[PDB]
Scaffold this active site. Structure first.
Site, PDB file in Angstrom:
ATOM      1  N   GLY A   3       0.805  -1.210   0.000  1.00  0.00           N
ATOM      2  CA  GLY A   3       0.000   0.000   0.000  1.00  0.00           C
ATOM      3  C   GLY A   3       0.844   1.268   0.000  1.00  0.00           C
ATOM      4  O   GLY A   3       2.075   1.241   0.027  1.00  0.00           O
ATOM      5  N   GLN A   4       0.146   2.407  -0.014  1.00  0.00           N
ATOM      6  CA  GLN A   4       0.829   3.695  -0.110  1.00  0.00           C
ATOM      7  C   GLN A   4       1.827   3.891   1.027  1.00  0.00           C
ATOM      8  O   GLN A   4       3.008   4.174   0.791  1.00  0.00           O
ATOM      9  CB  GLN A   4      -0.188   4.835  -0.123  1.00  0.00           C
ATOM     10  N   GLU A  41      -3.434   0.251  -6.354  1.00  0.00           N
ATOM     11  CA  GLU A  41      -3.436   1.341  -7.314  1.00  0.00           C
ATOM     12  C   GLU A  41      -2.003   1.680  -7.715  1.00  0.00           C
ATOM     13  O   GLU A  41      -1.055   1.376  -6.982  1.00  0.00           O
ATOM     14  CB  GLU A  41      -4.136   2.575  -6.731  1.00  0.00           C
ATOM     15  N   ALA A  95      -8.300  -0.435  -2.614  1.00  0.00           N
ATOM     16  CA  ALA A  95      -9.250  -1.064  -1.709  1.00  0.00           C
ATOM     17  C   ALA A  95     -10.260  -0.085  -1.117  1.00  0.00           C
ATOM     18  O   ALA A  95     -11.019  -0.481  -0.229  1.00  0.00           O
ATOM     19  CB  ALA A  95      -8.502  -1.783  -0.581  1.00  0.00           C
ATOM     20  N   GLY A 143      -5.304   1.873   6.314  1.00  0.00           N
ATOM     21  CA  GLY A 143      -5.667   1.745   4.921  1.00  0.00           C
ATOM     22  C   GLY A 143      -6.360   0.434   4.622  1.00  0.00           C
ATOM     23  O   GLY A 143      -6.383  -0.494   5.433  1.00  0.00           O
ATOM     24  N   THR A 166      -6.764   9.436   6.805  1.00  0.00           N
ATOM     25  CA  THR A 166      -7.455   9.346   5.527  1.00  0.00           C
ATOM     26  C   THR A 166      -8.934   9.026   5.705  1.00  0.00           C
ATOM     27  O   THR A 166      -9.793   9.828   5.324  1.00  0.00           O
ATOM     28  CB  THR A 166      -6.793   8.288   4.630  1.00  0.00           C
ATOM     29  N   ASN A 222       8.138  10.341   7.175  1.00  0.00           N
ATOM     30  CA  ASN A 222       8.802   9.131   6.701  1.00  0.00           C
ATOM     31  C   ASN A 222      10.319   9.234   6.756  1.00  0.00           C
ATOM     32  O   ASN A 222      10.991   8.200   6.788  1.00  0.00           O
ATOM     33  CB  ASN A 222       8.356   8.807   5.274  1.00  0.00           C
ATOM     34  N   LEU A 228      16.937 -12.414  12.796  1.00  0.00           N
ATOM     35  CA  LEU A 228      15.517 -12.303  13.122  1.00  0.00           C
ATOM     36  C   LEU A 228      15.129 -13.212  14.284  1.00  0.00           C
ATOM     37  O   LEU A 228      14.181 -12.906  15.015  1.00  0.00           O
ATOM     38  CB  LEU A 228      14.665 -12.618  11.891  1.00  0.00           C
ATOM     39  N   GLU A 232      16.850 -13.649  17.002  1.00  0.00           N
ATOM     40  CA  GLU A 232      17.200 -13.007  18.263  1.00  0.00           C
ATOM     41  C   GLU A 232      16.278 -11.844  18.608  1.00  0.00           C
ATOM     42  O   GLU A 232      16.056 -11.580  19.796  1.00  0.00           O
ATOM     43  CB  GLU A 232      18.649 -12.528  18.229  1.00  0.00           C
TER      44      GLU A 232
HETATM   45  N1  LIG Z   1       3.624   7.688   8.347  1.00  0.00           N
HETATM   46  C1  LIG Z   1       2.989   7.664   7.180  1.00  0.00           C
HETATM   47  N2  LIG Z   1       1.649   7.347   7.156  1.00  0.00           N
HETATM   48  C2  LIG Z   1       0.990   7.312   5.982  1.00  0.00           C
HETATM   49  C3  LIG Z   1       1.620   7.601   4.785  1.00  0.00           C
HETATM   50  N3  LIG Z   1       0.699   7.490   3.800  1.00  0.00           N
HETATM   51  C4  LIG Z   1      -0.486   7.136   4.355  1.00  0.00           C
HETATM   52  N4  LIG Z   1      -0.315   7.040   5.710  1.00  0.00           N
HETATM   53  C5  LIG Z   1      -1.288   6.656   6.746  1.00  0.00           C
HETATM   54  O1  LIG Z   1      -1.815   5.393   6.382  1.00  0.00           O
HETATM   55  C6  LIG Z   1      -3.223   5.388   6.574  1.00  0.00           C
HETATM   56  C7  LIG Z   1      -3.905   5.201   5.226  1.00  0.00           C
HETATM   57  O2  LIG Z   1      -3.546   3.944   4.721  1.00  0.00           O
HETATM   58  P1  LIG Z   1      -2.805   3.738   3.306  1.00  0.00           P
HETATM   59  O3  LIG Z   1      -1.548   2.919   3.491  1.00  0.00           O
HETATM   60  O4  LIG Z   1      -2.539   5.049   2.617  1.00  0.00           O
HETATM   61  O5  LIG Z   1      -3.903   2.889   2.486  1.00  0.00           O
HETATM   62  P2  LIG Z   1      -3.516   1.858   1.315  1.00  0.00           P
HETATM   63  O6  LIG Z   1      -2.667   0.731   1.869  1.00  0.00           O
HETATM   64  O7  LIG Z   1      -2.823   2.548   0.173  1.00  0.00           O
HETATM   65  O8  LIG Z   1      -4.908   1.168   0.881  1.00  0.00           O
HETATM   66  P3  LIG Z   1      -6.079   1.832  -0.037  1.00  0.00           P
HETATM   67  O9  LIG Z   1      -7.314   2.026   0.796  1.00  0.00           O
HETATM   68  O10 LIG Z   1      -6.342   0.851  -1.143  1.00  0.00           O
HETATM   69  O11 LIG Z   1      -5.622   3.159  -0.590  1.00  0.00           O
HETATM   70  C8  LIG Z   1      -3.607   6.720   7.181  1.00  0.00           C
HETATM   71  O12 LIG Z   1      -3.678   6.557   8.573  1.00  0.00           O
HETATM   72  C9  LIG Z   1      -2.454   7.627   6.836  1.00  0.00           C
HETATM   73  O13 LIG Z   1      -2.267   8.614   7.833  1.00  0.00           O
HETATM   74  C10 LIG Z   1       2.972   7.927   4.800  1.00  0.00           C
HETATM   75  O14 LIG Z   1       3.559   8.190   3.751  1.00  0.00           O
HETATM   76  N5  LIG Z   1       3.647   7.959   6.005  1.00  0.00           N
HETATM   77  C1  LIG Z   2     -14.957  11.796   7.952  1.00  0.00           C
HETATM   78  O1  LIG Z   2     -14.431  10.741   7.181  1.00  0.00           O
HETATM   79  C2  LIG Z   2     -14.270  11.060   5.861  1.00  0.00           C
HETATM   80  C3  LIG Z   2     -15.301  11.587   5.091  1.00  0.00           C
HETATM   81  C4  LIG Z   2     -15.069  11.866   3.754  1.00  0.00           C
HETATM   82  C5  LIG Z   2     -13.799  11.634   3.212  1.00  0.00           C
HETATM   83  N1  LIG Z   2     -13.415  12.253   1.972  1.00  0.00           N
HETATM   84  N2  LIG Z   2     -14.246  12.235   1.038  1.00  0.00           N
HETATM   85  C6  LIG Z   2     -13.978  13.195  -0.015  1.00  0.00           C
HETATM   86  C7  LIG Z   2     -13.623  14.496   0.347  1.00  0.00           C
HETATM   87  C8  LIG Z   2     -13.665  15.492  -0.622  1.00  0.00           C
HETATM   88  O2  LIG Z   2     -13.425  16.811  -0.398  1.00  0.00           O
HETATM   89  C9  LIG Z   2     -13.089  17.172   0.919  1.00  0.00           C
HETATM   90  C10 LIG Z   2     -14.012  15.178  -1.941  1.00  0.00           C
HETATM   91  O3  LIG Z   2     -14.000  16.142  -2.906  1.00  0.00           O
HETATM   92  C11 LIG Z   2     -15.228  16.831  -2.967  1.00  0.00           C
HETATM   93  C12 LIG Z   2     -14.292  13.849  -2.288  1.00  0.00           C
HETATM   94  O4  LIG Z   2     -14.546  13.684  -3.614  1.00  0.00           O
HETATM   95  C13 LIG Z   2     -15.187  12.491  -3.991  1.00  0.00           C
HETATM   96  C14 LIG Z   2     -14.284  12.836  -1.327  1.00  0.00           C
HETATM   97  C15 LIG Z   2     -12.779  11.029   3.947  1.00  0.00           C
HETATM   98  C16 LIG Z   2     -13.026  10.749   5.292  1.00  0.00           C
HETATM   99  O5  LIG Z   2     -11.998  10.197   5.976  1.00  0.00           O
HETATM  100 MG   LIG Z   3      -3.817   3.430  -1.437  1.00  0.00          MG
END
Ligand SMILES: Nc1nc2c(ncn2[C@@H]2O[C@H](COP(=O)(O)OP(=O)(O)OP(=O)(O)O)[C@@H](O)[C@H]2O)c(=O)[nH]1
Ligand SMILES: COc1ccc(/N=N/c2cc(OC)c(OC)c(OC)c2)cc1O
Ligand SMILES: [Mg+2]
Ligand SMILES: Nc1nc2c(ncn2[C@@H]2O[C@H](COP(=O)(O)OP(=O)(O)O)[C@@H](O)[C@H]2O)c(=O)[nH]1
Ligand SMILES: [Ca+2]
EC number: 3.6.5.-
Lengths: 426, 155, 437
Positions: C10-11, C71, C99, C143, C179, C228, C252, C254
């Site tokens: 993941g990201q 992605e 996901a 994530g 996120t 990071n 690993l 230890e």
């Molecule tokens: N420390 C750190 N946290 C990150 C970073 N990118 C995302 N996060 C954290 O990871 C969580 C989001 O999960 P992601 O790893 O981005 O999700 P994903 O594995 O790509 O899975 P998807 O839902 O498919 O996008 C959130 O709590 C973010 O704050 C990063 O570059 N550094």
């Molecule tokens: C409170 O929890 C959440 C609620 C909504 C989330 N974000 N959804 C989007 C936010 C957007 O603009 C802020 C947006 O642009 C208009 C968008 O386009 C589709 C989606 C993320 C959350 O973690």
């Molecule tokens: Mg992702």
């Protein structure tokens, strides 16, 4: 998640659907001839989300224009961006529904739905990774309501793993004093509850009240109203059309904005309110949560927020936005539920819309949206108790049981918002 | 039986046929199964001149159907200002109450017929009459947040 | 030696992995195209850095690593960045549809499309190991891919590599840089399904790193690049024992031996010092006593908890730089007396010490100042249970209402699985209370 299939149905849908393309083509630097004449790379990074690129550096919108009245295709073409749409997608019948939902859903519309679905398949096959489907329409008419909801259901059947998102205009006697529109809205809200994943609520009652008492326009037109609709649709689609720190799509929106499957009716808002032709951060966060700025005539202070997403546009300290947004949740903590942690999410965009330099668009999942459905249901109960004009429906194929069932499902929705409005954590 | 033919003629808006049936003795105050009279159906469908000719020929302007709806109720609901005025000038009960506790004013407020609302107020509509749930016209206005309606009822 | 493969999911797992491999290049003297001038043996090597870098015939030094995301966008930055010529391009794997921050998708629906290719690509890296120790696993908690695809992958590897240890670096979510609203759900389900399949997991609480970046580095609003870089320096100090000469945590096996007395309580707490802004280039160089005493300041912890209200079952010290072993004794000998630092009654009250005499490396463009000595303390304290309780209640606030649950059941997952996972976290909270918090 990249491709979106945008559809606009009926008179109202095509009107706001055409304004939608006029405002975002300008934002992305696209001219009425499909040529790109901008000066920024941020306009083409996610341009494919709503545009199908062609030869000669052309950008054709992934748009399917639908209606039963053949006059609507004429008014769209005489617009500034009226010839950028692909001619093959134009599907227009010969006999409008005449504000009859049953004609839209069962007879006149149903004979034309296959002509639209054929077009949808054509556009969906050209999708490398289609996200889902978008629709702009009205609920108080016949085509956008009756045919629009049939199309939503049939597309659902052939693409169940994609997301359906609608822009839906709620009727108001202050803009259209026609008595069959409560029937058509209630029949349409019944369908939107089951078949869509997220629906934006753009109430003509709220648009009138904004144009008349806030902007001071004694006789608003469909221009004053749609000036508000097209701006809102620019806001809630920003993070779909521009890079941003998140990879926001229609599903990430749904998963984090919809806690229970039937409560997917959003209350959009926009700041600053302004009239066509004719701001610090604490002001923007203030005005964005003000009842005067909501596109649905509900007072958010009568209910609780389940989830909120707020997007800013322009140049401003992202740190200050964080402090102000945290401030709003501290001084209004009695209007946000306590059993959904971190239920407010913010995003900032560099490129503001037209004219304005600052922008603030609000997306709310508020239990106060029941006041809208109560208002419609009261108008529906009065009409249906007297059986007024009911034969205009059963004479097309409907039965009286479809009125009671859509009515039974609508008032359940009101009870559900009130339930979670009173739910506590303890 | 021409009464069954007058009912359908008034609903459709055929002026000449209504004159024909009345001259041949048709029952101007006949009812369908739901107690609706030709005056009910003319008013519900906005056929003003059929309403007028019926009043000058003995029609009962305060006839109620099986649900207690007078022609004024149905005219106010559908929103026919002129017919509302013609009924009031021909002996209509402005505060008649159907089987749901609604007066005509209740119905003009619910549908936003703010013009007809003003007319009823001037011609005696009681702002204090409650429906079955106990809501006056003003109670309705504050609940659904209709400030335009609220202003008209306070004066 | 014995090789290690690092899997980045993941990201968050990919963006940390990119920064970690960058730092690994600098510390080892490896150039972005794979060449390593100081490696006197071309085309092979039994050195300690060969646990992380295989070698080709032309002198290339290639990370033992796999990058997976559903992605493409995040990994596409790695395929075209500075260290693009470094990795096995076949071990950079991307789908098309992420996901959607949904554990069920990452683990059941979408994750099914690519779980087999991921293993075959892992198998090609395993085919090149003489005596594989096991896996390093980098992934977010909150994530959808970081949770759901991780646990599916850990399930698979525990079937295919039954004799190889697994160590996770997992990013614990914080609302500051968050996120999805559903991240509490994702973190509870990933903990349950992976608990039996991981030997030792190092949590990184984004809230802790965010605050250190603001305080000790004076960064007003940190970005993920800021977080990071600090994380990678901490990861480097935790893995240096596998890549260099040393006597503590040499493999690993230890890590498990030293830090995990009971298998379920396998969440060590890392503390690291000193953290000093690069704008203070002329900082006075702190002493061994100062940086060692700083290993007990709750501020300098990678997971926000209070070890004062806890008991230690293990405490290892990892020094890097100008550190005299006698100076370590005097600094520790004060800690056993003056300070109230309680070990459990059944653990030998002692501090294990490792010393690497080269100072830490700084990356060009980073936020950290050069220092002459630093210390990474890996302990195991009952106080980290506080972090589990904080996350478990955020789960409870939503789960009582069944909020968002249909999103999971609609993606191939049974509603009951929520209950089995939450009881597993209740059992773990009881695990730490029984041991003595
Ligand atoms: N420390 C750190 N946290 C990150 C970073 N990118 C995302 N996060 C954290 O990871 C969580 C989001 O999960 P992601 O790893 O981005 O999700 P994903 O594995 O790509 O899975 P998807 O839902 O498919 O996008 C959130 O709590 C973010 O704050 C990063 O570059 N550094
Ligand atoms: C409170 O929890 C959440 C609620 C909504 C989330 N974000 N959804 C989007 C936010 C957007 O603009 C802020 C947006 O642009 C208009 C968008 O386009 C589709 C989606 C993320 C959350 O973690
Ligand atoms: Mg992702
Ligand atoms: N906001 C807005 N509402 C409209 C517009 N045109 C029609 N409506 C509303 O839509 C409803 C009628 O539906 P309409 O689209 O006109 O007819 P249709 O072809 O059957 O869908 C009524 O409530 C109108 O007030 C418009 O341009 N803007
Ligand atoms: Ca070598």
């Amino acid at each position: 998640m990249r491709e979106i299939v945008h559809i606009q149905a009926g008179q109202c849908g095509n009107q706001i659907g055409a304004k939608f393309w006029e405002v975002i083509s300008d934002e992305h630097g696209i001219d009425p001839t499909g040529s790109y004449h901008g000066d920024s790379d941020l306009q083409l990074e996610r341009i494919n989300v709503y545009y199908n690129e062609a030869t000669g550096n052309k950008y054709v919108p992934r748009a399917i224009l639908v209606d039963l009245e053949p006059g609507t295709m004429d008014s769209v073409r005489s617009g500034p961006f009226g010839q950028i749409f692909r001619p093959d997608n134009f599907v227009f019948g010969q006999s409008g529904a005449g504000n009859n939902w049953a004609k839209g859903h069962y007879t006149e519309g149903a004979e034309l739905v296959d002509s639209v679905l054929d077009v949808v398949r054509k556009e969906s096959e050209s999708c490398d990774c289609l996200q889902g489907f978008q629709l702009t329409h009205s609920l108080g008419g016949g085509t956008g309501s009756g045919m629009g909801t049939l199309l939503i259901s049939k597309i659902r059947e052939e693409y169940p793993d994609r997301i359906m998102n609608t822009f839906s205009v709620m009727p108001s006697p202050k803009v259209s004093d026609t008595v069959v529109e409560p029937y058509n809205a209630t029949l349409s809200v019944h369908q939107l509850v089951e078949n869509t994943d997220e629906t934006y609520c753009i109430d003509n009652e709220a648009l009138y009240d904004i144009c008349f008492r806030t902007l001071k326009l004694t006789t608003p037109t469909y221009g004053d109203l749609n000036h508000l609709v097209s701006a809102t649709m620019s806001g809630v689609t920003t993070c779909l059309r521009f890079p941003g720190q998140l990879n926001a799509d229609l599903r990430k929106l749904a998963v984090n904005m919809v806690p229970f499957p039937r409560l997917h009716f959003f209350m959009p808002g926009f700041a600053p309110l302004t009239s066509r032709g004719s701001l610090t951060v604490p002001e923007l966060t203030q005005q964005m949560f003000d009842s005067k700025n909501m596109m649905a005539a509900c007072d958010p202070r009568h209910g609780r927020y389940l989830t909120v997403a707020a997007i800013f546009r322009g140049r401003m300290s992202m740190k200050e936005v964080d402090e102000q947004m945290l401030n709003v949740q501290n001084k209004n903590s009695s209007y946000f539920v306590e059993w959904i942690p971190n239920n407010v999410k913010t995003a900032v965009c560099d490129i503001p819309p037209r004219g304005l330099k600052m922008s603030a668009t609000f997306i709310g999942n508020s239990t106060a949206i029941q006041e809208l459905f109560k208002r419609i249901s009261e108008q529906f109960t009065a009409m249906f108790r007297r059986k007024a004009f009911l034969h205009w429906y059963t004479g097309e194929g409907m039965d009286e049981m479809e009125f009671t069932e859509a009515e039974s499902n609508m008032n359940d929705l009101v009870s559900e918002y009130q339930q979670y409005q009173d739910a506590t954590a303890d | 039986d021409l009464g069954k033919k007058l009912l359908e003629a008034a609903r459709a808006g055929q002026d000449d046929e209504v004159r024909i049936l009345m001259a041949n003795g048709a029952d101007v105050n006949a009812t369908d199964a739901s107690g609706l009279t030709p005056l009910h159906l003319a008013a519900t469908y906005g056929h003003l001149e059929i309403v007028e000719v019926l009043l000058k020929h003995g029609a009962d302007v305060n006839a109620i159907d099986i649900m207690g709806s007078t022609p004024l109720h149905l005219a106010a609901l559908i929103g026919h200002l002129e017919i509302v005025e013609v009924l009031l000038k021909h002996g209509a009960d402005v505060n008649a109450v159907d089987t749901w506790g609604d007066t005509p004013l209740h119905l003009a407020a619910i549908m936003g017929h703010l013009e007809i609302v003003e007319v009823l107020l001037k011609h005696g509509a009681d702002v204090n009459a409650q429906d079955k749930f106990g809501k006056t016209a003003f109670d309705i206005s504050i609940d659904n947040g209709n400030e335009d309606l609220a202003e008209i009822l306070q004066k | 030696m014995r090789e290690c493969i690092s899997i980045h999911v993941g990201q968050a797992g990919v963006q940390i992995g990119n920064a970690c491999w960058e730092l690994y290049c600098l510390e080892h003297g490896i150039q972005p195209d794979g060449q390593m001038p100081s490696d006197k043996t071309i085309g092979g090597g039994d050195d300690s850095f060969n646990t992380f870098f295989s070698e080709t015939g032309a002198g290339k030094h290639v990370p033992r690593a796999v990058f997976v995301d559903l992605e493409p966008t995040v990994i596409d930055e790695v395929r075209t960045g500075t260290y693009r010529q470094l990795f096995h391009p076949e071990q950079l794997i991307t789908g098309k549809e992420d996901a959607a921050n949904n554990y069920a998708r990452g683990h059941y629906t979408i994750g099914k499309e690519i779980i087999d290719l991921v293993l075959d690509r892992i198998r090609k890296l395993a085919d090149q190991c003489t005596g594989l120790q096991g896996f390093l696993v980098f992934h977010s908690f909150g994530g959808g891919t970081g949770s759901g695809f991780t646990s599916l992958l850990m399930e698979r590897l525990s079937v295919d590599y039954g004799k190889k240890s697994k160590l996770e670096f997992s990013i614990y979510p914080a609302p500051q840089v968050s996120t999805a609203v559903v991240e509490p759900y994702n973190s509870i389900l990933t903990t349950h399904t992976t608990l039996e399949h991981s030997d030792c997991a190092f949590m990184v609480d984004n809230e802790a790193i965010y605050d250190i970046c603001r305080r000790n580095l004076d960064i007003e609003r940190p970005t993920y690049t800021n977080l990071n870089r600090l994380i990678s320096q901490i990861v480097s100090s935790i893995t240096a024992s596998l890549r260099f000469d040393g006597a503590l945590n040499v493999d690993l096996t230890e890590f498990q031996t030293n830090l995990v007395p009971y298998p379920r309580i396998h969440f060590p707490l890392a503390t690291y010092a000193p953290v000093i802004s690069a704008e203070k280039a002329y900082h006075e160089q702190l002493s061994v006593a100062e940086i060692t005493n700083a290993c007990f300041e709750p501020a300098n912890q990678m997971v926000k908890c209070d070890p004062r209200h806890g008991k230690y079952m293990a405490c290892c010290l990892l020094y890097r730089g100008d550190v005299v072993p006698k100076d370590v004794n005097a600094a520790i000998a004060t800690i056993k007396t003056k300070r109230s630092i309680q070990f459990v009654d059944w653990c030998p009250t002692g501090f294990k010490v490792g010393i690497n005499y080269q100072p830490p490396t700084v990356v060009p463009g980073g936020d950290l100042a050069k220092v002459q000595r630093a210390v990474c303390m890996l302990s195991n304290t009952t106080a980290i249970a506080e972090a589990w309780a904080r996350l478990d209640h955020k789960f409870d606030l939503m789960y009582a209402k069944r909020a968002f649950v249909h999103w999971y059941v609609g993606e191939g997952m049974e509603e009951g699985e929520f209950s089995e996972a939450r009881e597993d976290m209740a059992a773990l909270e009881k695990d730490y209370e029984e041991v003595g918090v």
